[PDB]
Design a protein around this ligand. Sequence first.
Ligand code: A1BDV
Ligand code: A1BDV
Length: 147
Amino acid sequence: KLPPGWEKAMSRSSGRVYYFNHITNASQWERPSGEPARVRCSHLLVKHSQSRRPSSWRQEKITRTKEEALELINGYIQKIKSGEEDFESLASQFSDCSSAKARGDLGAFSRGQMQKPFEDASFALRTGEMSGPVFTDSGIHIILRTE
Ligand SMILES: OCc1ccc2c(c1)OCO2
Ligand SMILES: OCc1ccc2c(c1)OCO2
């Protein structure tokens, strides 16, 4: 009936149906559209105190909690979806990954090289599409599939 990982849901505040993806944590109002050996993605990572390594080029010692990291990820997604901010601009200023220097770009990758929640969400995105919060042992990611 629907592409991989999508399900219908109901808005609590409006009562309108929307669509949610349980692999990429994306959600949207309109019915979704329509696998490759490699995909190319960029991401914005916000680390927290239970990250596998709680440090980044932004902070010698990352102290925020998982919940606070999710709040920051959530706000970045809001500004991206309203057009007030561009994904690349936010990944460059605020991503806790060294790939901030490349506007969040990671290059092309195949299955079996990334942390697996990241991998599954990347390959479940369509080209040009962005995820919601995706959780790994590094922290919380926003993923943009560029190829
Ligand atoms: O952390 C991984 C990583 C991937 C691509 C990059 C990078 C870091 O920095 C320059 O481009
Ligand atoms: O495997 C997923 C993944 C990709 C790139 C990353 C990362 C995790 O942590 C920071 O850079």
